[PDB]
Amino acid sequence: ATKSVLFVCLGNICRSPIAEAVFRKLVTDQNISENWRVDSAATSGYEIGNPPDYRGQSCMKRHGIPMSHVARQITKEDFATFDYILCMDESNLRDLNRKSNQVKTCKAKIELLGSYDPQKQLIIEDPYYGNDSDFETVYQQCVRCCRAFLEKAH
C-alpha cells in the first residue's frame, strides 16, 4: 500500500469502525484493497480493547459489511504514517489538531469525513445515546463520504 486513511472518533466503537469497514469494502470491491492501508482509532482511552458497539454490528450485518475491530487510541506515529485522518465531529477535530501539534512529523491531512458528503451533512453525530435509526444515519453518511473521498481526495 502506498495510500492510507485513518478514521477517528472519540471512542472507536460507534462511528470510526463503521467508516473504516465501509471504506475497506469499497476498495475491495474495486480491486484496489492492496493499494490502501485502512484503519480506525480513538482520541481517548475510554474503550481500548473493546469491539465495536453491538448496535453498530447489527446495522452492518443488515448491509452485509463485515466489521472486525479492536478499539485503540491514536498514537504519535499515526500522524507520520497516514496520508489522511478523517474524523467525525468538531470535537474530534479540535482534539486531533491539538495532538498534531505535539509531534514533529505530521504528514496527515486532518479533516472531517463529512466535508466529503455531496448531501453536505458536515457532522457525523455520535449515535451512542441514540437508537438504530441513528446508526443507520451514520452508516449512510459514511457510504456517501467514503465514495466521494475515494473518488477524489482534498
SS (H, E, C) the chain: CCEEEEEEECCCCCCHHHHHHHHHHHHHHCCCHHHEEEEEEECCCCCCCCCCCHHHHHHHHHCCCCCCCCCCECCHHHHHHCCEEEECCHHHHHHHHHHHCCCCCCCCEEEEHHHHCCCCCCCCCCCCCCCHHHHHHHHHHHHHHHHHHHHCCC
Q: What are phi and psi of 26, to 5 degrees?
A: -45, -60
Nearest residue to 78 (alpha-carbon basis) of 106, 59, 46, 116 = 106
CATH of the domain at 111: 3.40.50.2300
Residue in the structure block whose three cell numbers are 492492496: 34
Nearest residue to 124 (alpha-carbon basis) of 25, 26, 19, 39 = 19
Number of domains within the chain: 1
Q: List beta partners, residue 37.
A: 4
Measured CA to CA, the distance from residue 20 to residue 128 in angstroms comes to: 18
Q: Is 94 a catalytic residue?
A: no
Domain containing residue 33: 1-154
Elucidation technique: X-ray
Q: Which entry of 53, 59, 126, 146 is annotated as an active-site residue?
A: 126
Q: Is 9 a catalytic residue?
A: yes
Q: Is 146 a catalytic residue?
A: no
Nearest residue to 60 (alpha-carbon basis) of 5, 21, 114 = 21
Measured CA to CA, the distance from residue 91 to residue 154 in angstroms comes to: 21
Measured CA to CA, the distance from residue 19 to residue 4 in angstroms comes to: 14
Q: How far is CA 131 from the centre of its chain?
A: 20
Confirm if 46 and 14 have CB atoms less than 8 A apart: no
Measured CA to CA, the distance from residue 26 to residue 24 in angstroms comes to: 5
Confirm if 16 and 8 have CB atoms less than 8 A apart: yes
* Resolution given for this structure, in angstroms: 2.1
Residue in the structure block whose three cell numbers are 465495536: 52
